[PDB]
Amino acid sequence: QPAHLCFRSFVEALKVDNDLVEINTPIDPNLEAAAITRRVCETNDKAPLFNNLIGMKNGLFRILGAPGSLRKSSADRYGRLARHLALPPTASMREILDKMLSASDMPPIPPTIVPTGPCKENSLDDSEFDLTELPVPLIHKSDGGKYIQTYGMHIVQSPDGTWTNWSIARAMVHDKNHLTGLVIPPQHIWQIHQMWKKEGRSDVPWALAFGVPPAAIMASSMPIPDGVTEAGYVGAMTGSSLELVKCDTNDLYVPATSEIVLEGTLSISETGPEGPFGDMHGYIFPGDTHLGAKYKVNRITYRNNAIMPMSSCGRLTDETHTMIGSLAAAEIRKLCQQNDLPITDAFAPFESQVTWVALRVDTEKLRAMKTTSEGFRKRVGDVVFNHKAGYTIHRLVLVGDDIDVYEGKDVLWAFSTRCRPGMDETLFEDVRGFPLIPYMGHGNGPAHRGGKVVSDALMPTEYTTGRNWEAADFNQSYPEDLKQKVLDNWTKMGFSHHHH
Amino acid sequence: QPAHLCFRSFVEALKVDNDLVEINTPIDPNLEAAAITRRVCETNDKAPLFNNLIGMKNGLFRILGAPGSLRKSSADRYGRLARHLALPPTASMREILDKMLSASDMPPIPPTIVPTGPCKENSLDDSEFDLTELPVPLIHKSDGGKYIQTYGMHIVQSPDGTWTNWSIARAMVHDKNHLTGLVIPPQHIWQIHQMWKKEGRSDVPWALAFGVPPAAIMASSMPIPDGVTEAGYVGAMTGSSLELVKCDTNDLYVPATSEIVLEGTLSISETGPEGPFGDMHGYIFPGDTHLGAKYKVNRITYRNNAIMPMSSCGRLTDETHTMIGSLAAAEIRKLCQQNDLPITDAFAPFESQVTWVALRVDTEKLRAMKTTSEGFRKRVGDVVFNHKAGYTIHRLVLVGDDIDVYEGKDVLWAFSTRCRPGMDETLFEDVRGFPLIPYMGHGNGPAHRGGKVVSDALMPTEYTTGRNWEAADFNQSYPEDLKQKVLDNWTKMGFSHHHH
Ligand SMILES: Cc1cc2c3c(c1C)C(C)(C)CC=[N+]3c1c([nH]c(=O)[nH]c1=O)N2C[C@H](O)[C@H](O)[C@H](O)COP(=O)(O)O
Ligand SMILES: Cc1cc2c3c(c1C)C(C)(C)CC=[N+]3c1c([nH]c(=O)[nH]c1=O)N2C[C@H](O)[C@H](O)[C@H](O)COP(=O)(O)O
Ligand SMILES: [K+]
Ligand SMILES: [K+]
Ligand SMILES: [K+]
Ligand SMILES: [K+]
Ligand SMILES: [Mn+2]
Ligand SMILES: [Mn+2]
C-alpha cells in the first residue's frame, strides 16, 4: 500500500529515506521515549522508532515519535510532511498547503467499506485489556496522566448520520477502561458532542484510531469546514476512495490499515480529571488539572506488531507547529479569498509559536480597492477572527508582495519595520480566544475572549500608487550584472551545498 | 600598538584571526566594494580589505568593509567586536556590553596630547584635494550621494570647551570641499550644534576622523550621557589615556593613529541635499532627498597607505545592528538600574531589526515591589522612552529570569506566548520617535512622535508568588539523570562541534 494511505508503509518510507532511527534495545515509556523524541524535535533529527518499549505485551505496542517533524536539511525540510501526501520530499510549504486545500473545490470521494483489514489482526474485549497496563507514555515529567492520544484520530458522527468527523484532540488514560481529554468549542468533536447532548438519549458512539493513513491524519489536523466529512475530503485530495472497516462494537468505520483502534463512547454526562499537559506553546502548568470529557473503551483491535505514533510536543519544532499552524494558515488563506480579500499566501511563523499568521497581499488588487489600513484591517480581522479557522491565531500580520510569508526572518523584518505599534493595528476583544496560549488561560484577562490583533505591515503607498522603496540588501541594492560578477568571483577572491 | 588602540593594528588582528580577505585586484568603489561587503554581512563571512580600490591616488585610500559585523561560528560570533576592546574573541555579548558600561562608574582618564602621529604622515591643503576625485563609495544603487562617512567619528566641542563629543552620524560628499549629513535631535552632534547656533557667532569647529582606535569607535556608537567626553570614557574603559594630536587648522584633537582626518567646520546656517541612504532598518526610498547639515572641509591629513573603514549597512547583519542596537541596549540596562528598576540584562534582538529591546527582570525583586503590570510597564516606558538612550527603540519587551535576552529565539517565544496583545501592553504616543524606521518617517503618523510600546511578557504570578510553569522542552521536562542518559546514548542509539 502507498505511504500516504497506510501508516505501516509510511514508516518504511521514512526508513528508506534515511529519516528513521530504529531503537531495538529497551526504552522506557515513562519519559525516556518522549525525551528522545523531544531531543529529535529540537534538533530536527531522524524520527525514532522504538521497537522494544518496556511494558509492550502481546503486540501492544511499539512507538514512532516525531512523525510530522522537521528534517535538518533545507532542501527536504518538510519531507515528513510530503511523505504524508505522496509529494516529493523536496516539496515546498506552498505545495504542501496547496495539496491540503485542493479537495476544497472537488467533489468528495466517499470511502469504500471493506470486510476486513490489518486493524482486525488482533482484538481484546472488555475482559482482556487494561489501559493502565499498556506502555502508554508519560510525555512530560509534570503531565497529569499518560497521554495515549497525541497522534490518533477521533471518529464521531452527527446523530443524523450525515457528518462523520475525524480530528486530533489530546487524551490521557483515566483508568483501566476510560480516557479523559479535551473536547472544547469550537472544535468539531465538541460541535458533534453538543448535538448528542441536546438529543439527550445516549453517549456518543466513538472510535479512536492510531496509525491511520498519513493523508487522513493531515486532514484530521486541518480545520476544514463544518459538516464536511474528512474521509471524503481525503479521498478527493488523494484521488482514491479510502478503505474503511466497521468497528466490531459500533457502526463507525475506521481505516482498514489502522495500527490500533479503540471503540467505545464519549459521555454526554461524565467528566474526569484531565491535564495538565505540555502543549504546543511550550508550557506546562503543574498541578493545573481541570475536568475534561470522559471516554469509555469497550474494545481494542490492532495490527500484528502495532505501532503507536506519538507527538512529544512543546517548544519548537513538532507536529503542533508544522501541522496545526500551517494547516490553519492554509484554511485561513482560502477563507480570505472566498471573502474577496486579496490574499495570495498564509503561513503561521514558527518564531511566533504558531500564534501569528502572516497574510501576503496582492497589492495590485489592494490598490484597486481604494481603501485604507484601518478599514482593511478591520475587514480581514472580522473575516478570520469570527471563523473557526482563526481560533488558534491571535495576531494576523498583513504584508505586501515582496515578503515570502513562509520565511519567518522576512515576516519578522516586515512586522518590525512596517507596522507602527498601536496606530497600524486593530485589537479585537469580542472574538473567541484560544485559552491554551499562556497569556489567555493563565493571563490577565478573560481566558476565552479577546486578545487578538491585526497588525498591518503594508506601507502607505501600497494602498495607493505602489511600493516606494527598495531593500538595502544584496538582491535589491545592486544591479544584476554586478551581483553575478560578485557571485562568480566569490571563491576566487577568498570567501566561502544546496542538498547538505 | 594594541588592536583596540590603533586601527592599523586592528586590521592585522583580523588577518591574524583568519577573519580578513585581502583583495589585491582592482575593485570599483562605485557599488562593487559595497556589494561584496553586503554579501559578507548577509552571510557572516570574513571582513574584506580592498587594497586596490579604482580611483586610489597618492595614498587615498584602501577600504575595510564589515569592521563590526558577525563571524559565522557561534563560538566567536562577536569576535570582531571583542577585537575592538582587547577582549578574548570568544567573549559573550554580556561581556562586551559590560566592558562598554564599565567606565560609567569610573573616573574619566583624560586624553594625552602628543606632538605628532601617523595621521600626520601626509597632508592636503585646501588647493590640493577634491572630495569628488577620491574613491568614495557608492554604497547602495539608489543612494543620493557617495557616503564617505559610515564608520568615522565626528568630533565637535561645546562653545565653553567643557564637552568634546565623539559620534558616528552618516555623511556624503556634496562637492569638492563639502559634505552633507544628518545632524538630528536628540543626538549629541545636534545638541552641540544648537549651542553654537544660539551663540550665533561662528560655524562649529569640526573634525572627522576615520580609522580611529577601535575602542573609540565603539564609544562613538554608544549613547553615553550628555556632557560626557567620550575620550575620557574610553580612557577609563581601556585603562589608558588616549593619545591625541591637534588638528592643523583648528584646535580640536584627533587620535594620533587616525587613518584619515578631515578638518573644517559644521555650518550653523547652511544646508544641502542629503540622502536618501540605505540605512539600518533595511530600506532606501529612492529620490527621498531632504536638506541636511553641511560641512566644509579645509584640510585632509592621512597615514601612508590609509585605510577607510566602511559599513555597507542594511538588512541583517552589520554594524548598525551589532553596535547601534547592542550599545543602546547596554545604556538602557544601566538607565533602568539607576532608576531603581529590577533589570538585569538588555539586548536589541536582531530579529526586530534592533527596534525592540528585551529587558530581563529580576523577578524576586519585582515581587517585593508589590506592583502590577500596568503600573510597572508605565514606569519602565517613562524611564526609557523619555531618555535619549531610548531614542532608537520602539518596543520594550519585559521578560522574566528564565529568558536569555541575548537569544532572539527565546525572546520571540516569550513575547509570543506571555504578552496578550493590547491588554498586556502600554502605548506611548507623546515621546520622541525615531523617524528613520519606515513606519515612522514613511508611515501613517507623525514622523517624530509616538509609535512606542511596552509589551509585558511577564506572567501574572511573576508579580506575586513566582513562576508557576515549567517549559515543555528537553531541559525542563525531564529529570537530570534521564537527560544525561539520553545525551550519553545519543550517537550509540543512531542520532547526530562547539568551535566549528
Ligand atoms: C497535530 C495536532 C493537532 C492538535 C493537537 C495535537 C496535535 C499533534 C496534540 C494532541 C499533540 C496536542 C493537542 N492537540 C489538540 C488539538 N485540538 C484540540 O481541540 N485539542 C487538542 O488537544 N489539535 C488541533 C486540531 O487537530 C485541529 O484544530 C483540527 O482542526 C481539529 O479538527 P476539526 O476541524 O475537525 O475539529
Ligand atoms: C555604528 C553606527 C552608528 C550610527 C550610524 C551608522 C553606524 C555604522 C551609519 C553611519 C552606517 C548609519 C547611520 N548612523 C547614524 C547614527 N546616528 C545618527 O544620528 N545618524 C546616523 O546617520 N548612528 C548612531 C549613533 O552613532 C549613536 O546613536 C550614538 O549614540 C551617537 O553618539 P552620541 O550619543 O554622542 O550622540
Ligand atoms: K479535521
Ligand atoms: K503599516
Ligand atoms: K557617543
Ligand atoms: K503578560
Ligand atoms: Mn472537521
Ligand atoms: Mn556623546
Author numbering:
A (entry chain A), B (entry chain A): 4 to 499, 502 to 505
Please quote the paper that reports this structure.
The UbiD superfamily is composed of a wide variety of (de)carboxylases acting on aromatic, hetero-aromatic, and unsaturated aliphatic acids. Prenylated FMN consists of an FMN molecule modified by the addition of a fourth non-aromatic ring joined via N5–C1′ and C6–C3′ linkages between the flavin and prenyl moieties. Following binding of prFMNreduced and formation of holo-UbiD, the cofactor undergoes oxidation to form the catalytically relevant oxidized prFMN species. In the UbiD enzyme family, Arg173, Glu277, and Glu282 (A. niger Fdc1 numbering) form a conserved ionic network.
The high-resolution crystal structure for E282D (1.06 Å) reveals that residue Asp282 occupies position I, with slight movements in the protein backbone allowing the Asp282 carboxyl group to occupy a position similar to that of Glu282 in the wildtype enzyme. In this case, no C1′ adducts are visible in the electron density. All other residues occupy the same position as in the wildtype, with hydrogen-bonding distances remaining constant. Whereas the more conservative E282D variant was still able to catalyze decarboxylation of cinnamic acid, the corresponding E282Q variant was completely inactive, as shown by both end-point HPLC and UV-visible spectrophotometric activity assays. For E282D, kcatapp was found to be 0.63 ± 0.04 s−1 and Kmapp was 50 ± 10 μm, compared with the wildtype Fdc1 kcatapp of 9.4 ± 0.1 s−1 and Kmapp of 10.0 ± 0.6 μm. Hydrogen/deuterium exchange occurs for wildtype and E282D within the 20-min dead time of the experiment. Furthermore, the pH dependence of the reaction for both Glu → Asp variants is similar to that observed for the WT. This suggests the pKa of key groups involved in catalysis is unperturbed by the Glu → Asp substitution, with the lower kcat values observed for E282D and/or E285D possibly resulting from increased proton transfer distances, as the carboxylate group is slightly shifted in crystal structures of these variants.
